């Protein structure tokens, strides 16, 4: 809702101005359609600035948050990630995502984790598929999130086999946050 | 339905009475229960008679298909199977399974054979286990067939990949069935 | 419903006494296992005395009417077809099957007769096998049809390519019937 | 529902062993399987003896109806018809259908006659096929209301274009029923 | 479904009068008392001769699990379990409970272990009694399925953490059977 | 379903011939009124040798489960009372409601016991008086509770402010049962 | 539900047999009729000796237990009338409605009054005519409850009210029921 | 809805521009992201001038309700809390992170505490995971709690068990406001 | 719906410029926030001058009223409330909360004072504690509703009992209101 | 959503301006028609210059796919394909279709290649053309994937004929794509 | 969606302006509404210019698809028919509706023709009248294509029999479009 006053923005637009991109909800391709053409937008704008990216998210789509996540990687402007309330699944993997030294969580804020969730159905051979392609994508999002925590692959797949629920203290310790924000 | 003099039996009550059983649905453990039962019951009645099961049915349960399969194995009377209509998937699986020489279909029946069918939602590790499951119990299916039929290993599996219409010469050729029963 | 004063029956099992078996539902799996069971019962009984088909049917699985044709065409004694009301689509094909010279409609029973009726869904491989399949049920319908009508296959092609509507004449001009019955 | 005393009865088997037949419900091909069974049985008990047919009925499947239709001009025996209530659309052709100088209706008992309904979708070509056999069913009727009534065919069409609804002296005069019961 | 000749029962009771008791469906109330209720039965009728319980189960309520597996050890006859088809969960729990010596499958069958299913709804203390509850009711579970295995509890928690699919070969070898059934 | 050999049972026919009552479902009007008069049915054949209660029930009416209660303590006979499974709630309430000395619980048989639950819509008034309602219900239940068991109502309001799952030993403990009975 | 040995009767069956009938629903005209007809037949058996009708109801219908009411009081016999479990509503109408010195409720049944309940939609007039007939309906019901309560018409109006929830020994007090039976 | 005369705004962007946030509703992601978003905007106006948070909220996601608590914690102005209305749950808990000095009630504003709700389904392992989770979240909200009233863990503890209505002079007493705004 | 000649407004923000206010639906929260910021804003522009506010409203939500109650008697300028149609319960009291003097009503203006409405579910601690809740919100309402019509507490109670509906000039003459408003 | 300062654009109408289109959808015929007009566009504002495509999509109707792919031939500017997270099935054959040379994936982005999906109902006939159709379809398919990326359509239809998961390298090797963009 | 920078339009409204007309949906009478508005607004902008008519159509209803036919004819201006992805059913009668020579297809857009579809039901009668309307509209339809395709009447009425679906080239054979667009 709420307008701006300045021409007419709405209150994320204006925040937009500002390089800020708030993700507060599930990761699907309209969500990440939205995310990816406002980093686009704010490269052009400036490609030298940094981005702050406020995330609150169940996560969602792995595909979709992979859209998200390249296009961070991609983009010149260090992209800042900043949690807020929960980054949960995909959520804490793009919060893990951030330019090094630059990727926080407010004090209350909850980080989860855990493995990837999908389905199959049909003959043996397309649930065969199905199960391989789930199990390739953990081990991409495995590999991934080895490189930006600096723990071994083998502890992450350990770690993500449940529910995996860390305070912001504990997120810093694992390696998925550089800092948790203290009030200022 | 109907009632047929003699005390009362319903019409299949009656055909039970000459050790005939008409497999005519779907497979499903209600179903599976009630076969297997009637085997047992017409073993105990007489060990050395053969029984007539007559299958019309697109198959089903696999689980509950190896109830029956298994409970036609272990008594001692030979099983004839007269497929009328259609035998699809577990239902050509039990066809197959009769005593040898005493495989049968009518004229104009089909027998369809493919690889079964099935599910799989949740977590990467639980749809790998699942997958697994499917993969073992196509494999058990497969090797079953190839005793069977004499049919190879190799040869099963590709012809199962897609759905697999056979007429009742094909399905005597293929090994599937002993003789197609010519009108009396 | 009715009980019948002899034992108890309902009028179906009286009138299978008399070696009548009534059609008049719809042709499903179901269906096609008490026709075909009634069949079995009655030439064990005697396999000499004619049965008599009464037919009020709209039709409906293949596979299950060609269950009831080829018991129909496998037992000993000659089978009867009265057509009541209307055969329709596979209720009309069962009419045809009866013994030769043995096959009747009431002056006002009409008789319907159409190509084959199917679905299919999922990947062009699996519409092709689906398409085949249909293809060569309707192939073997007109192949039978022709052998007991004496018309063409070509005619048989062509008549059924449409919904085709016969009154009880010309079902006897055609061959489908030998004779219609005058009131007695 | 309720039981008799003789063996144990329904009240429509009891009924039934004294020749009469309750039509009390809408005319499908249940009904008629049911009614034209019911006629086979009483004609193979006693030929000569005559039938009585109550109708309350407000029609159904005109296919049905002609199954019922047939098998009463078939058998030997007369078949009474007295309406109760209401005889509608096919079950008022029934009524009309009973043995000449045996058609009856209790004093307040209503007869309605209209054209056939039914459907039609699909290609224009289906649509004229569905369209040309309704209006085929329909000729047959009013050709056999002729007949029966004495009423000219002409005046048949006219008189069933719309819902026409007759008191018991009504469808005397029209030659639907013969005599209306006074009350014994 | 089916009659015998004897008076008339149902296949299932004719086969409780030779002591055979058929678990053919999921586990609940309705089902464990009726097992209960055959079980004390047959040994009113004789607390000697050994009770025959066949299964073929995809488990269900744990409790209603128990009143059957309380009812098997308490009563004096032995109670054979002979796998069919599939036990599965609490399924497998009860096949697993015969007696020492006499717990069989046939060759194709299935068993499934794991821990078991629940939900919790509401405030955060009624989760943690729930929770309690079924982490309590896996304890007692596991310790039961230790005694009758012969493995360690340790490793019985390690086996039903997820979905662990056996073989009959694997189910005798891990001691939830003790034989598996050549045929005969 | 199962039928028994004698005239015909089912098979708690059988065990009421034996003086054995089976409770194994939710408990409501429908449930209470067949408890009820199985109860006085019993005592009208002897009223002197004891009634045996197998419960296995998730509770249900309270008010239902009153007529029950005050059946038990109305009646000549001793009423045993036997949980298998679980008895919770109203269920566990009628457990203790057995004869002193003669209540029983199987080794693995779970007892849960709660506060009563209910519901209110309206008027603040009507609220308030189904309100009193509910509550004096429960005083009522303690009260009762309290006379069974020998704890106090205090005890009583503190132990079932929440769900409170005891052990078969647990409940001997607590004085809902007498003894906890060991195989035979 | 249970069968009983004597022929086979159901459990409530056998009770009417010491004239006993069993209310254990809530009343409507399928359970009036059933009460009337057990009241009649009980009559038509024995005019002298007195029945026994158990009550456990939350009501329902207003005419269907009026139906009840007037039978208990046209016939011969004394209705003794048992409150068991619940009497609200009609159900507690009935209650009091029992041959006097002979209407009894068990320590712990419930007794409830309170207005009767309806609803009313259309015009103006037609509420007008809905809600005339209702408040004629409660005048008729607090009539005949201060005819044998007792107490007055005004004070009845008052009680009656709101939702009146009353213990046994409270009814007995206000004359809703002659005696709480003490257990025996 | 209502517009305003200034550019055009609606009625709460046009109350933003006097930096006053309106929170009138329940709590979940999309609100929390709106309200965390308005925060921002106005520290990045002026950094110096207080907030002022209109609370009427029955509260809703814990996750999303700590973006918004974390937020108010992080910015330099001061948020002033004002309950108008009801805040319940997580809506009470943001009424007590205001400024200290500037949390406020109207007279009549209600103000609820109780422990947090959630739900849990699948293994035992799983509700285990979920139970602690909750557990712990409640642990961080009393902690919190403990801090913004000046109340022991403890005393939360106990008064947040149940649903804890209070008015906002209690609201005052008990630490979660600072004054009850008296009519200007 | 319509725009207004000016900027563009619609019809309800063109009157709010002449400081009045429609309140023409049910009480809910989201119509609660509209009207307190209506009032916040008007206030923000002139406090001196006073509010219009015109009801036609059946009530709702009691919370969402007190947040409309409150902020009226905080906010400087005098509130004037004008009954339009209908002011029922929540409307009513609404109505009565305007400035002393300043309260209106059409002469055809319908008021309605009732009792509050509520409901509550589970556990019958739960249901005491949401029915002190909704008793002390009726004392609450009905407080302020003696202090402001003149009459006593115990009239108050006894006239809110059940619907109570009042012309303009009898609410009036309760107190309700001011005077009823005389064509101009 | 969000808006853009420059006049007011949405975020996707400011890329626009920049010659970049975003596909983050399933590929409908509202998508093509979409689609289609922007590429119309920006050929009609510059002609010279190359245009963006970002393809985030998991494909769906293949005539709309179409619609886009001769748009793209047809059209005189460059048509750049980027997939960001996954271009699956019609999605990875757009992909495909950008100009050689410059058709890019980021490095995580996946690529899925499978046969056309489809259904058909019905005649016979009519399930004919329907398959006849589809085949024909990928036949076009295959055929211009060939050309695309330098693969042989023998290799095209073995590839496709399930589900094909490709990595951004493996979509690269495969000819699909140009390069993987390194991270810039 | 997309807006383009000039005032502000949509991305339709932008290619309106240079007289572009884009039909991507189902022909109903609101997309008929507006194409028609369209092509009479760009009459009156210019009547010797001529208009560029995109079609990717599924078709829909006939009468609205003739609003936009005699829309076309009526007009000064050439309408220049453009298909791309597909031009099915009334569809492909647009498309063979434009200016002779000025009628294309991109070298991949499908075109369908076939006999109009629809429905009706009710008195022999009414479906009678719907049959003739049909067959006459089919008449309409398929004299128009002769004249626009140059084909013989008796050829469309049998290459529409049946679903026909044709290519580009094929398309331009019929004489349904001029020329095929080469890439430019």
Same mark, same amino acid.
Do not use: W
């Given at each position: 809702?709420? &307008?701006?006053?300045?021409?007419?923005?709405?209150?994320?637009?204006?925040?937009?101005?500002?390089?800020?991109?708030?993700?507060?909800?599930?990761?699907?391709?309209?969500?990440?359609?939205?995310?990816?053409? +406002?980093?686009?937008?704010?490269?052009? +704008?400036?490609?030298?600035?940094?981005?702050?990216?406020?995330?609150?998210?169940?996560?969602?789509?792995?595909?979709?948050?992979?859209?998200?996540?390249? &296009?961070?990687?991609?983009?010149?402007?260090?992209?800042? &990630?900043?949690?807020?309330? @929960?980054?949960?699944?995909?959520?804490?993997?793009?919060?893990?995502?951030?330019?090094?030294?630059? #990727?926080?969580?407010?004090?209350?804020?909850?980080?989860?984790?855990?493995?990837?969730?999908?389905?199959?159905?049909? +003959?043996?051979?397309?649930?065969?598929?199905?199960?391989?392609?789930?199990?390739?994508?953990?081990? =991409? /999002?495995? #590999?991934? /999130?080895?490189? #930006?925590?600096?723990?071994?692959?083998? =502890?992450?797949? =350990?770690?993500?086999? #449940?529910?995996?629920?860390? &305070?912001?203290?504990?997120?810093?310790?694992?390696?998925?946050?550089?800092?948790? @924000?203290?009030?200022?």
């Amino acid at each position: 809702i709420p &307008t701006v006053i300045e021409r007419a923005y709405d209150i994320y637009s204006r925040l937009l101005k500002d390089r800020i991109i708030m993700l507060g909800s599930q990761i699907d391709d309209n969500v990440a359609n939205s995310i990816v053409s +406002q980093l686009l937008f704010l490269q052009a +704008q400036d490609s030298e600035k940094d981005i702050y990216l406020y995330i609150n998210s169940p996560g969602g789509s792995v595909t979709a948050g992979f859209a998200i996540y390249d &296009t961070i990687q991609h983009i010149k402007p260090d992209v800042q &990630t900043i949690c807020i309330g @929960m980054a949960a699944s995909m959520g804490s993997f793009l919060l893990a995502a951030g330019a090094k030294g630059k #990727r926080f969580a407010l004090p209350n804020a909850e980080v989860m984790i855990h493995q990837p969730l999908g389905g199959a159905q049909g +003959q043996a051979t397309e649930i065969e598929i199905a199960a391989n392609h789930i199990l390739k994508t953990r081990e =991409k /999002l495995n #590999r991934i /999130l080895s490189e #930006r925590t600096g723990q071994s692959i083998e =502890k992450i797949q =350990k770690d993500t086999d #449940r529910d995996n629920f860390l &305070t912001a203290e504990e997120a810093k310790e694992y390696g998925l946050i550089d800092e948790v @924000m203290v009030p200022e």
